[PDB]
Structures are given as structure tokens and as C-alpha cells.
Design an enzyme around this catalytic site. Structure first.
Site: not given
Ligand code: MG
Ligand code: MG
Ligand code: MG
Ligand code: MG
Ligand code: MG
Ligand code: MG
Lengths: 299, 299, 299, 299, 299, 299
Positions: B72, B182, B184, B210
Site C-alpha cells: 500500500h 500475513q 488477515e 482486513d
Molecule cells: Mg491488510
């Protein structure tokens, strides 16, 4: 029933913005208003990180001004232009832009003005003549001889102004833009009475660091606290000169709790945070606290 | 008698740096050392501002790691490369670099590795197969099939390695670099036992935001505080899976005082500050305090 | 008596802007409003020059939208982000942003959305499945699985939304953002009835050039004018499919006088100028006229 | 039978290009040729958008020159260098480059010359001495004292020149490069006879906007048309001075139909389009026409 | 048993680096050491390609210095800053940085110093007064009046110095930084005795090219070899002046085999390779050899 | 009598350039010509430094091609586009451009093609299907389904082609552009007979480094010289497959004296210098020689 226009609480409060955000907001009036009511002293942020993304983050916090340092900030020409635009557009006109320029760089100055800066801080001022050279370059005739740029607007398309019959925004520029000499040398302090009395200026700033070096004072050398008497005298002469001539002082606050005292001293534009030192201290402090709190798990 | 070499107190303490700072430091060992002694839990900073100047400011505070978000964060390719180099060089090897990459972008991944990233965080992991695709691209044969770049070094000139007969730093890369999935999403949590058990991984991270969106939980919706039970269960399943498999948890600390609790929960790499939110809150808070303190001058 | 706030005539008319200009304006509603009243058909400009300065010049002309082409426009990641911000901020919310993205590039897509794009055009669409892959990445759960970025806002500081209890602007994103498949191949035309019927889409665009190449038709080969019958049939099938399903057509106008006919055909978003070709033709034409007028001075 | 070399009709017509396109084309001769035959008056384009991509689009239209404004155009140093190279290379030598530089910026000047600019326009000229300062910096000894750059060429590899035994292209530079003073102030007009008579100059330009501001004339204030008499007199004095000394006038054409009159007045280099205003007006006009044509669908 | 700290053979040998690599290394002492022992003559590389990636490649070869040319090198401000940082960080302090600045550009000078340059070369020096203007801007009081930048360090976080109680690195700057006048004109040579005798200088450089042009000598015009007598006399006067005053000469070596002779002549800082010409000749030569070796396959 | 057009000896020899240098030169024919006459084997340079300034320096040496590595070279999108343009324009069409792209990055591929690359090298090829995916994206129908960009040209203004009635340069693209699979894995070598036999390919390249790693061979591990037998067999299978199918080999020359042997082996496109390693070795070697020659002055 829920569009932006129908939700006044979400609207930007930008008391001094120009008709177009590509033009300077009215810092001249903002300063006069702060002098009339010191509770309106402008609280801003110093910006030395050469990144328009950072300018956008700073602008979103809605400071009364973003103070961009081009004397020592590594901003390229186009990036300076973009940072000034970003400060005003991403704050939707609430954040006026003040730029400290290199003392003899005409391009930095024209770039800052053409992009919409409302205030120019001139470093190392020692004579009234040095200030008048900036007046010549900062304002259009009859005040000065500033050159008019054709690329900042578009005739009949993007040329709005708050002033009547002002298609070129000459009135906007000459009525909104401010000049702020910075006193930061022994000779500057010695001639501050004359500089402070210039009808052309709108603010005065002191440079403690450069002054102390020039005065041969041990910067950050207060053995048992208490600043050097020579510095105290210098600040007294400086502040009294500004006050007697009705000139607001521009400065920074080492700690935010200093604000009341600064206002009492005549400051009407105060940078309450600095992006480089602020971010550095925030991160360094968090790291220190975190590591310290982890020591209990040793072994 | 006063050169840098003669002043050991000024020397950098970089326990995990490689022979050359253009190569990844040993995050693999740093994590193992933190597991053995939790007082050594890595304290770092999250970096989302796309500016190498900012990376340099962050690196100078000497964090245990700089976590760069490419999923991001608006980093261009060359700028990502430069930020990774700056983090390691301006901290003189003390700050390891972890990069969260876009889930399917091979160029972001090769750029991060070629520049010296020691850890890669893979977002939205839901299957062991997704993780193995990263293993293939992250490590050289026999472990994977990562492509060897010729431009990262110079044969016989700049090719030092901590490992024996390792002129191409293949050993450096395969021994120092870490993979951190990760978790999420609801499906990710449902399959966390399998992901946590992968012999190939070196850390695990959770993505609360998320996850909450995917789970249909009101993010930032704790009426009377107390997180949603579904979230609590998810975090319990996640943390227990990491702990049982000897996998350290990677995460962030909303407030630095949360560190002890996070360490007790198994976190061994904690981002204790975030550049974007940190700078924003610092400036916004200073402005608020300043304006509030000026109200006494009204009238 | 003359500040900006006291001069309503100077205020921006931005019917669809979000609470913050870093978020997408409501293109969804703009399209519905244009369908209800075709005199409100969106008139915009296509932007292929990779320069945020150009975006600013285009935004100042106040188009209903700026259509940024990332499939073929040479925009770097950060520059794309800055162009999207500039379009919305320099038009003060009047110009919505539509971005045509590369068909398989997740980073271009997340960058466009995170920066505030209100519409995404998907090139070379041939199946409903291809469109649903974009739905998954474009919208947050429960609609899709779009990843939430932490760097786009600042909790409690810069997080305004037009929607109630929407601190993360999830509602803004899921209610304002539009998906527009682009049909530009023989297979795409053959399956247009199914694509046009998708409940998930908000617009349809045709790609004449790519279609003609794929169909083996002599692009720009109308001997005595009159487009190829195969093309006519293709456009008829395409337009009828859009019309029957209540989907507005997105397209360009080779000449502005084509607008009425396009509106009659169902177009509700029309790019009436293209920066690259427009500037090229303007300059080339002026040069030709100038040289021609100088011929009288020969000898 | 169909290679480029075998298709003369496709070859570039670049009458004044140097041996290498990294060096200035012969603007000196182009101007002399236009004076001898006014049908050859140079028709060019003004370039104020700081984007080399734009320079490339402009160069492809094959203007006789690209006039780059560095006094007010936001070009960074490297970008200016690249724009000058792009203008000459993408027009394959057909487009000469003229650069208006900031009046006192030596770096902008050396950058423009080192990159291949064939003409330099000096703003706000009021004295012959100001022009001679530019002569000193613009030409190599014996004419001036311009510093020779080593990085512009490569000895024995890339050092071609149209002149004999000119391995350093000193002859190219001193024979091709032109100086054009710009008169745009009351004092400038008052001393135009002396400036126009300088043997060192190759052209003269007027700055109507800056002149009008300096003269206290209402720019864009022709009540019933008819320019102010003071302006008329100023232009008459300026044009007569240029004509009597055999100096061609450089200027812009508000509308292309003004070209014949300008040529009759002595203009031999005319910018017939301006990128910023041209693009702005083209897009704004197309939007207006489009919206107007859509009104018939209201209801 | 194999960490970097445990492998001394891999440690950088940086005899003159400062406590922090963002500050200038001790070029002053390096020059004194080379004068005492000419086998320590500094061997460096000239850098004119405006690319920090190139600076990194050059720094990795560990030259004694990287000589960055800002007078003629197309470095933007931020890029210059980054190149200086890269030279010192990627050589881990082994490569000192010398910058030749434009003669009158204060911003280039402050940028070079603020970034860590240890030496400044002043072009076209003809008077002692010109050199003293640089002394004023290059050193802090009491030596000069250089302005102190707040953004180069972080108080209490990143402010290490090799000197006692030097939190602002004022001692570092005033003790490490060197001034090198460049003599490259007839007037410069005529006044070299006075310039060479200035107590403020630390080195002297000659500019053969500019000198020859100014002297009206056919640069690269040695019919039967043997340089022009006027040039020989000029170099003799220059070198003798430097030698008698104990000033080391700075220069370049057309071919590396010239080094011994240059050292005998008093050179103590020699650029033995130039990035632009070096790369050009390397590639051009390889191409020529390759094509020549392929001729045997003709037919 | 001395203009460029009147000096044929100065004209560029660009046998394969297209009508416009923004389009690919005819690498297809260049390769066929080199196969017919090996003395015409293309001698080029590998470009991994992400700097268009470097591309310009390389282009000025007039290599037969510039090989840009995007798989491992840190080129941003716009910079890649600019480098490709610079290679062709600064060599005035003499230098064709070949780009090695990341194996799965569609944007890198379209950018390289849209900018004018004449050859695409595909890394890690192991199946005929992988190559056909590139054919689909590289060529317009009927050969593939490459998307046509509108921003690369300007209809009726800048659209010249060497081919008849080819206003969109579709013929130029489909007739000039080449596909070169790179074999660099055990599986690739095992399937090289099939890959080499594809009618769609125009060249074959081997990746020794990646192959050796994948094969578990000690890269740079020839104890007493003599490459590993497994590698020898691999190269034999590879070269024989290319030769039997009439496919020229693309490769690099560690030392220029290897060229004759490479030509005998079937190489028809050889990179004889590499910018990163070449510059590094040139500078490092010069430094070593210089320091060595200074040792005689010790004491
Ligand atoms: Mg995320
Ligand atoms: Mg100061
Ligand atoms: Mg298309
Ligand atoms: Mg003017
Ligand atoms: Mg010189
Ligand atoms: Mg490979």
C-alpha cells in the site's frame, strides 16, 4: 439529502483562502487579525523533508500554515512548486504557505511566489537595502518590479480573484503576500531598530542558532541553564523593536507549552512542530521506551 | 589519537549486518536470538511515506528494523530500491529491512530482495501453496528458483560475504532472508494451523483491519470496549498456532505501553511507530494544544 | 465583506465530491443522474501525458471527469497517485477520476483506488469471470476482498466521510466506485450480452481500434466512408446490450459535434478531448496555418 | 528496396541542424535566412509545461523552434537538459531550441547552452551592460569567457562538428548561438535605441504584460478596444529600433491570423501556440461545446 | 564465530571518516598526510553522470574520493544531496567527497556542504576576494558566516562528532572542510602567486581546457606533440606557486601511467578515471575490437 | 556549402531504422543479415544502470544494440520508456533496442514495446506455452492480441511507416519485433529442442549463472579451469538446437577476444560490454594501478 453540499459540518473553514488555491491566501490579513486578537495566533508546522507526500500529510492536519524551508530544505524547483500547491489544496485553503528562501536565489523566490506562497522569510537580514531588494522582486508595479508569469493561470478559464477586475490576480498578490526579515547575526541585531521600522515588512523572525554562532556564544551551553546575557539582550532588543513598530514576531516553539509565553512576547505566527526533528524524536523515543520495557524478559 | 577508528564508543553496533550493506542482514538469526531472549524482541518502525529522505531520518534513529510497505505504500521501483539501501546504510547495518509486498507482484519482490531486504511479509495468505510460490521466488536453488541478478555486485571488486567461498552471496541470501505470511481473512484464520506448521516460514503476522472487514465485524466498533468475541477467538487460534510451532509473531503496537503484553503473547518483532500516522498525530496534537493554550488571550 | 466565504459566486460546484478529496467522488450517482437526465451526460478529458502538471492544467478547466490511461499511459506508481489527487483537488472535487488499468496489474489497480479513483475501466474483457476478479479486488467485504490501506487517512484527524459511522470510508468506497468493462475483441463482442447483464457493472465501453485489428478490419480504411458492416453489427450488438440492461455507455468523441448522436446512442460519459492528440493537432495546425499565411512574403 | 535510406520522402528536412543533435542548430543562419525571405519566418511553440514527454509531443509536430521558458517554467536542471535534448532529437534536428532564462541564474544559462539551446532570451533588459554580461557567459573566448564542459561530448567518439578542425565544437557554439534581449519595462523602452544597436545581439523581444504593469496601464483594459496610446508609442519605438538596426523581432501570436501583420512589423520568429494556454483553451472549449449541445436532452 | 564483527578482515578501512557519514570526512588531514608521504596521494574518480545509482557503483570501488562536478554536471539539488550521501555511505566512509560548484551559486554550495562534501573546488578563480567570498559561505563563525542547517542532524539522537562537546558538528565542519581554487584563465595565471599564498586555501587545481581557450591556444593542437610554450609557462608558474606555499595540487590523469610524474610535480589528489569519458571509451573501444575481429567471417 | 545536408560524411548510417525513431528498428532483418554474413554479427552493450543519461552516453558510442535489463535493472516505467527512446534517438537509429523483461510483467512488456523495443528476451523459459503467451502480447492480430496504444503517435501528424498504407504502424511492429527465449534452468535445457523449433522465435539466449545455480554446479568453481561437464553438455545441447533450427544465439562476451569463438558457435548478437561491471572494473583497475605506482614515493 446527504451530499457534501448538504452537510455543512464537513465544509472547510478557510477564512483567508483566495478564489483559487493556486494563489496565495491572505496572510496579510491573518497576521492583522492575530494582532487584534492573540488567541488567533497562527499555529503552524515547519517542513524540511523534501517530499510532497509529507506536505500532504501535514496539510491534512490543518495547520494555520506550513513553513517550507528552501534555504536548507532539499527541495528541487518543481517539487517546491508541488509542495506549495499541495499544502494549500490538501488543507482546502486552511493552511497558508510561508517559505524561507535562500538569501540570493531569484529562482527559488519566483518559484515560491508563482506557486502560491503567502509569506517569504529572508534569512540573514542586516540592512534595509537587502529587504528592499526583495520588495522589488516580490511585488508587481507600482510596488516593485516582479515579473508576471503566464503559466500560473488561464485567461477566461482559470483566473478567479477575490478582487474586482483583477483577471491577472495582481491585486491578490500585492495585497496578500508578506515579507518577513530574519535577524540572525550580530550586525543584524545591531541594526534591528532600522529593519523593524521598515513600512514594507509584515513580520520579524529571529535565528537563535546562527546568531549564537556569529556571537561566539556556546550554542546549547547553558551550564546551569540560564541563556547567555548577550543573547538575552539581543532578544530583548529584537522583540522590543518589533513591538514598538507593530510588527508581529514569527518563531518556533521548542516545546508546545512555551506558546503562552511566546504570545506574551509578541509572537503571532508560531511553528509548533518540525517535521524532521519531530518524526526523529517520536520514533527514537518510542524505540527507547519499547526496548526499556522489554528488559524485564531478559534471561 | 582522535580519529574514528580510535574512538570505539562511536562505532556502530550492527550484530547482524552482512559483509556489504547492499546485502541483507541476518534477520533469521535476529529472530532466533529474540526467541531465545525476549528482551531482544526487535523494535522497529513502519514506513509508508514514499521518500528516501524519510527512510534516512528513520534509519538515523537506529530501529532494529524498518518495515517498508509496498502493498500500500506508493514506492516506485527505483525509489523502493533506494529506500532499502538507505535504511541499511544510514543505520550502518543496525536496521534490518522487512518489506510487505503486493501478493502477486514479482517485480516488487525481486526489487526488494535484490536491494537487500532481509524479510518479506506476504499479505492475505490463505494456503500453504501461496507461501510456497514465494519460497520459489525468494530463494536460490536448491531451495527455490530465484533468479540471480548481475547488477547487485561486482565480481572481484564488491562481492564480500560472511560465508566461505560465497562470491555471489548465494549463501548470504539463503541463510539470512525470512518469509512471514500475513493472516488477515476468515479463510486464512480457518487454515492457520497448516500455515503455521510450514517448515519454510520464519514468522507470522496478523492483519486485524482486513480480518475484521472480511469477518463482517464493526472495525473500531467496541461499544463498551472489549473486542468482538469472533476476533478474540481468531487471535487466539492464530497466536496459539504460531506458539506451538515455534514461530515468532510480527505485529504493531498501537501504543508503546502494549509492548510487554505483546511479548508475553509471542511477538518478537514489533513496529512501535508508523511514519504516516505518527507524524500526523504528532503535528495535529501539537496544533490542538497550541490553539487551546492561546484561548486565554481572546478579547 | 469580500472574503472567499462571503463571495458565493466563487464557490466550487462539486455535486458528487466526498467529504475529503483524497477519496472518490460519487461517480455511481453521477451516472445514475445522467441516465435520468441525459443533458447531464458527463463530459470529460482523456489524460495520457504522464505529468501531474498537465493533470493540474486539465483539472483547472473543470471537466466532469479526467480519464487517466494506465494501460498505455506511462505513469509511474507515485505519479499516478499524484495525478489522481491533483485531478480531484485542483478541480476542488468537480472532476471525478476514471482510470483504465492494465488488465492484470493488481498494483496499478490498488494504487488507482487508494488515490481516489471513482471508476475503473477494464480492458479486453471477454468473460464475466474476468470482471468478477476485478469486483473482488475493487470492493471491501462483503462485496469483495479489497485490502484496506492504512496510509490513505489518519484516524481521528483526517477520516471524514459522507456516510454515518464510516471512519474508514468503507461505505464511501463501496458506494461511490464504479466498474466499467471495455469490449474490444471479437470474443468480447460475441459474449457482450452476458457481460452487459452483470449486476456488478456500472458502465460499458467499446475499443474500436483493438476491435478492428482483432476482427481483421482495415482500421481507417473506409474507401468511400461508411464503416465496415462487421463493425456496424458489432457496435449495434454492443449498444443494444448496454441499453437493454440499463448500462450507460462510456466513450470518446472524435469531434465534439458528435456528442448529440452519442447521447442518443446511450453514451452518458464522453471524453471530448484527449491531451496527447489534442495538443499535437492544435500545435501542428497552428504551425501549418502560420507557414501558409507567410507564403505571400516569398521573394 | 524499402529501407529508410531507400525512402527519401521519409527523410527529415533539418536545414540548420549541427553534426550532432546534442549541439545547437544554426539559429543564427535561420534568422538571417528569414530576414532575407520573410516567408521563412520561424513558426514555433512556447513550452512552459515541465514535462519532457510534452516536449516530445511538441517536437513531433515539427515546429521551427521550441521556446522553453525557464524564467517562469518549473523545469528542474536535469529536466531542462532533457527537454532541450528531446526537442532537437525528436524533431530530428528540425526544431531549434530557444530558452528564456532567469535574468541572473548562471546555472540555468549554462545548462541551457550545454544541452544544445541555439537561442537565449534575456528578460527585463534595461542596459547594454546587462546584455554584455550574457555575452561573457554565452560565448567562448575570444568572444566571451564561457566555461567549456567536458561531459557534453566524448573525444574521438562523439565530437562531430560542421566546422573544420573543431573537435570541441567551439566554432559550432560561437557561430550558431543567438542572444535575444527582452524589453519589458519603462526603462527598457526608454533605452531601446541603445540596446537595439548592440552588434552582439541577434533578435529583440517585447514583454507586453510586464511592460503594461510597469507602465501602470490596465492590462486587458481596452474599454472600446484600441490599446493604450502609451503602449502603442512603446511598441513603435521598440519596432522601429529593431528595424533600423537590422534586428529581427521575436514574439508571440495571440491568434494565428495575426501572423501576416507581425511579419509586416518585422517579426521573424513567432510562437504561434503556447502549450499551457493552448491545451487549457482546447479542453475548456470542447467541454463548453459538449455541455451546450447536451442541453437539448434536458427533461 | 562468524558475524561481521568477528571478521575484522571484512571491516572498512576509513581513516578519515567522521562520527556520522552524513558529515564530511577529514579531507584536510588526508591532504596533509599525502603531503607528508606522497605514496598516500589521493586517487579518486570524477563523477559527471547525474545518477545516484552511478555514485553507488563508483563508491563500491572504494576510491579515495569522488569528485562531483556541479558546475557542468546536471545534478538537481536533491539528487546532488543524495549522491554525496551515497558516495560516503556506500564506501562506508572511505571515499571523501569533493564538489566543484558553479562559481556564483549559493544553493549548490550550501547543498554540497550540508550533504557532507569535504572539499569545494571553485572554478575560474582570478582574485583573492573571490576566494574569500567562499570562505565566508563555507565556514561557520568565527571563520566565516555559513548558515547552520537544522535538518542535517537530530539533537540527542543523531549528532555524533569526533570532537569534544561538538553537538552541532561545527568543529567537524570547520576542521575537515577544504577550499580548492581552480585557475583556468589568463588573468588567473597572472595572479596565481597571490592566490597560492592565501592562508585560507588547502589545494590548487588548473583547468587546462578553459585556460587554453582563454589564451587563444589551439586546444588539442600539438602538431608534432609538444604543448604550446605559453601553456608550459602557465603550468610552471602555477605549479611553482603551489609548491612554494605548501599547497597540494589537485588534478586529473589523462592516462593512469601519468601518476608518477604528476606526484613529482606536486599533485596530491588525482582523478584517475572520469565516469562519462571512461564509460564512453570502454564501450566504444570494445565495439571497435569486436567488429574488427568479426571481419574474418565476411563472405 | 557546409550545412549538415551538404556533408554526407557526417550522416548517420542506420540501415534498420524505422520511419520514426519512436518505433522499433528492423531487428528481424538485422538478425537475418548477420546469419547470411557473420561479419555483421551485432555488437552491443548491456544496460543495467537506471539512468537515461547513461543510455545517452551508451547510444553515442553507436552500438548495434542496447540491451536493457528490466528483469533485474531498476528502471521505473517512465524511465524505461525514456531510455528506449534515448537509445534510438541519440544513436539516430543505429542502435536497436532489446529488452529483457520480467517473466510475468505485462506492463513492463507493453511499456518496452510501446516505446520502440525491437527485441524482447524472455527469462527462464521452460515450455513452448510460455513463449506463446508472449507471442499473444507482443504482436497485433492476426498474429497475437497485443493492445494498440493511442498515445505513441499522432494521426496525420506523426505516423510515418516504412510500409504502405500503415498509418498505425501495425506492419512495422509485426515485421520488425523479435522474440528471444532465454534458457537458464535444468528443465529449460531438457526441453530446448522443442523451444528451439518454435516457428515464432527469432533468437535464443542462455543464462549460465541461473543455469549453474539450478543445476547445483559451483558457479565460478573451476578448480583447474575447465567448466563442469554437465554445463558443457547443456551448452552443447542448447547451441546445437539453435543451429539446427536456424536460430541465431544471443549472448555476452566476458572478454572481447571471445567474439570469434562465439561467432563460430552461432552467436549473432553479442553484448561486448556491460555498463555496471564495465564501469566498476575500469575505475577499480585505474585506482589499483595508480596506488601501486605511487608506492615508490613512500618514506
Ligand atoms: Mg491488510
Ligand atoms: Mg539561520
Ligand atoms: Mg484498446
Ligand atoms: Mg515578462
Ligand atoms: Mg573549466
Ligand atoms: Mg538469469
Amino acid at each position: 439529502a446527504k451530499s457534501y453540499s448538504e452537510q455543512p459540518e464537513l465544509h472547510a473553514k478557510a477564512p483567508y483562502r483566495s478564489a483559487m488555491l493556486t494563489y496565495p491566501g491572505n496572510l496579510r490579513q491573518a497576521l492583522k487579525d492575530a494582532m487584534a486578537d492573540p488567541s488567533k495566533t497562527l499555529m503552524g508546522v515547519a517542513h524540511g523533508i523534501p517530499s510532497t507526500f509529507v506536505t500532504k500529510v501535514l496539510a491534512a492536519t490543518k495547520p494555520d500554515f506550513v513553513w517550507i524551508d528552501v534555504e536548507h530544505g532539499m527541495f528541487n524547483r518543481l517539487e517546491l512548486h508541488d509542495a506549495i500547491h499541495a499544502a494549500q489544496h490538501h488543507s482546502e485553503g486552511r493552511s497558508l504557505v510561508i517559505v524561507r528562501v535562500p538569501k540570493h536565489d531569484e529562482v527559488s523566490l519566483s518559484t515560491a511566489l508563482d506557486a502560491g506562497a503567502a509569506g517569504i522569510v529572508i534569512p540573514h537580514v542586516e540592512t534595509v537595502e537587502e529587504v528592499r531588494e526583495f520588495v522589488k522582486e516580490m511585488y508587481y508595479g507600482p510596488i516593485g518590479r516582479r515579473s508576471f508569469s503566464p503559466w500560473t493561470f488561464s485567461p477566461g478559464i482559470a483566473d478567479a480573484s477575490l478582487f474586482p477586475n483583477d483577471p491577472y490576480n495582481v491585486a491578490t498578490s500585492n495585497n496578500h503576500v508578506c515579507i518577513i526579515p530574519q535577524i540572525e547575526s550580530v550586525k543584524g541585531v545591531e541594526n534591528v531598530d532600522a529593519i523593524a521600522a521598515m513600512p514594507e515588512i509584515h513580520g520579524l523572525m529571529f535565528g537563535p542558532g546562527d546568531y549564537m554562532i556569529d556571537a561566539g556564544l556556546d550554542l546549547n551551553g547553558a551550564l546551569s541553564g540560564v541563556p547567555h546575557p548577550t543573547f538575552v539582550e539581543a532578544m530583548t532588543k529584537f522583540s522590543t523593536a518589533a513591538q514598538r513598530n507593530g510588527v508581529p514576531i514569527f518563531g518556533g516553539a521548542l516545546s508546545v507549552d512555551m506558546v503562552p509565553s511566546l504570545i506574551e512576547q509578541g509572537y503571532r505566527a508560531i511553528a509548533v512542530q518540525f517535521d524532521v526533528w519531530g518524526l526523529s524524536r517520536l520514533v527514537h523515543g518510542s524505540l527507547a521506551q519499547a526496548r526499556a520495557s522489554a528488559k524485564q524478559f531478559a534471561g
